Amino acid sequence: QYRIIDFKRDKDGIPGRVATIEYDPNRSANIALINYADGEKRYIIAPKNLKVGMEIMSGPDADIKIGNALPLENIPVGTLVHNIELKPGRGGQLVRAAGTSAQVLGKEGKYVIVRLASGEVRMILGKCRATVGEVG
């Protein structure tokens, strides 16, 4: 039932478990309490189909599953993503908790090409992070 949503998703390597999923009218969105193995607790926007009991992870080594956050360079072409970082570190700036998820279309050099819901296409630094899944 809480206030701060983690849009940074920087607990890399530390496995978390989806404890609960609840609707926040104030945010017109589902939010999940994640219990990390180091005892830390955080809330994130719950993507479509995320479920209690599922495991979560962030970083270069996380698998490609909804709720997981990884640098775009590590995300497979065709993946739907949200909470997209524009400059490596600034955290999610695009489609953080509402709208329609973007889709990775291709990877070239030190950039990943993404198609926003509107059809708009952007090339973004591979080091920039995104969370796998669909929102709003």
Coordinates of C-alpha atoms in Angstrom, one line a residue:
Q1 CA 0.0 0.0 0.0
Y2 CA 2.9 2.4 -0.5
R3 CA 4.2 5.7 -1.8
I4 CA 7.6 5.3 -3.5
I5 CA 7.8 3.6 -6.8
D6 CA 11.3 2.5 -7.9
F7 CA 11.8 3.7 -11.5
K8 CA 15.6 3.2 -11.3
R9 CA 15.5 -0.6 -10.9
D10 CA 19.1 -0.6 -9.8
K11 CA 19.3 -3.6 -7.4
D12 CA 21.3 -5.5 -10.1
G13 CA 22.0 -9.2 -9.4
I14 CA 19.8 -9.3 -6.3
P15 CA 16.7 -11.6 -6.9
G16 CA 13.4 -10.3 -5.7
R17 CA 10.0 -12.0 -5.4
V18 CA 6.6 -10.4 -6.2
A19 CA 4.9 -10.3 -2.8
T20 CA 1.6 -8.6 -3.7
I21 CA 0.0 -6.8 -6.6
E22 CA -2.5 -4.0 -5.8
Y23 CA -4.3 -1.3 -7.7
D24 CA -3.5 2.4 -6.9
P25 CA -6.4 4.7 -8.1
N26 CA -4.1 7.6 -7.4
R27 CA -1.8 6.2 -10.1
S28 CA -4.5 4.3 -12.1
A29 CA -2.1 1.4 -12.1
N30 CA -1.1 -1.8 -10.4
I31 CA 1.9 -1.7 -8.2
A32 CA 3.9 -4.7 -6.9
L33 CA 5.8 -5.0 -3.6
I34 CA 9.1 -6.7 -4.4
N35 CA 11.0 -8.5 -1.5
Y36 CA 14.6 -8.7 -2.4
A37 CA 16.9 -11.5 -1.0
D38 CA 18.9 -8.9 0.9
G39 CA 15.9 -7.9 2.9
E40 CA 15.1 -4.7 1.0
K41 CA 11.6 -3.9 -0.1
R42 CA 10.5 -1.8 -3.1
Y43 CA 7.5 -1.2 -5.2
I44 CA 7.4 -1.1 -9.0
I45 CA 4.6 -0.6 -11.5
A46 CA 3.2 -4.1 -12.1
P47 CA 3.3 -5.0 -15.8
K48 CA 0.4 -6.9 -17.4
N49 CA 0.4 -10.5 -16.2
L50 CA 3.0 -10.1 -13.5
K51 CA 2.0 -12.4 -10.7
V52 CA 2.5 -13.0 -7.0
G53 CA 5.4 -15.4 -6.5
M54 CA 7.2 -14.6 -9.7
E55 CA 11.0 -13.8 -9.4
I56 CA 12.3 -10.4 -10.5
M57 CA 15.8 -9.2 -11.5
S58 CA 17.6 -6.2 -13.0
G59 CA 21.0 -5.9 -14.7
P60 CA 22.9 -7.3 -17.7
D61 CA 22.3 -10.9 -16.3
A62 CA 18.6 -10.9 -15.7
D63 CA 16.5 -13.2 -18.0
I64 CA 14.0 -11.8 -20.4
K65 CA 10.8 -11.9 -18.4
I66 CA 8.2 -9.4 -17.5
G67 CA 9.1 -7.1 -14.7
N68 CA 12.8 -7.6 -15.3
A69 CA 14.9 -4.5 -16.0
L70 CA 18.0 -4.5 -18.2
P71 CA 20.1 -2.2 -20.4
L72 CA 18.5 -2.1 -23.8
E73 CA 21.6 -3.6 -25.4
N74 CA 20.8 -6.8 -23.5
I75 CA 17.1 -6.9 -24.6
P76 CA 16.1 -9.1 -27.6
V77 CA 14.7 -7.5 -30.8
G78 CA 10.9 -7.8 -30.7
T79 CA 10.6 -7.4 -26.9
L80 CA 7.9 -5.1 -25.6
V81 CA 9.4 -2.6 -23.1
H82 CA 8.4 0.2 -20.8
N83 CA 9.9 2.6 -18.1
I84 CA 12.5 3.5 -20.7
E85 CA 15.7 5.4 -19.7
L86 CA 16.7 8.2 -22.1
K87 CA 20.2 8.9 -20.6
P88 CA 21.9 6.1 -18.8
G89 CA 20.9 6.6 -15.1
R90 CA 18.2 9.2 -15.3
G91 CA 15.8 6.3 -14.8
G92 CA 12.5 5.6 -16.6
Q93 CA 11.3 8.6 -18.5
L94 CA 9.1 7.1 -21.1
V95 CA 6.0 5.0 -20.5
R96 CA 6.8 4.6 -16.8
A97 CA 3.3 3.6 -15.6
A98 CA 0.8 4.4 -18.4
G99 CA 0.3 4.3 -22.1
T100 CA 1.5 1.6 -24.4
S101 CA 4.8 -0.3 -24.3
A102 CA 7.6 0.3 -26.9
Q103 CA 9.2 -2.5 -28.9
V104 CA 12.8 -3.1 -29.6
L105 CA 13.2 -3.3 -33.4
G106 CA 17.0 -3.6 -33.8
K107 CA 20.4 -3.3 -32.3
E108 CA 23.3 -1.5 -34.0
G109 CA 26.7 -0.8 -32.5
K110 CA 26.3 1.2 -29.3
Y111 CA 22.6 1.9 -30.0
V112 CA 19.2 0.1 -29.9
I113 CA 16.4 1.1 -32.1
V114 CA 12.9 1.3 -30.5
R115 CA 9.4 1.9 -31.8
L116 CA 7.2 3.9 -29.5
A117 CA 3.5 3.1 -29.5
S118 CA 2.7 6.1 -31.8
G119 CA 4.9 4.5 -34.5
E120 CA 7.7 7.0 -33.6
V121 CA 11.1 5.4 -33.9
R122 CA 14.1 6.4 -31.7
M123 CA 17.6 5.1 -31.5
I124 CA 18.8 4.9 -27.9
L125 CA 22.1 4.1 -26.2
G126 CA 22.3 0.4 -25.4
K127 CA 23.5 1.3 -21.9
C128 CA 20.1 2.9 -21.3
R129 CA 17.7 0.6 -19.3
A130 CA 14.1 -0.6 -20.0
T131 CA 11.8 -3.0 -18.2
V132 CA 10.3 -5.9 -20.1
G133 CA 6.5 -6.0 -20.4
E134 CA 3.3 -4.0 -21.1
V135 CA 1.7 -1.3 -18.9
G136 CA -1.4 0.9 -18.7

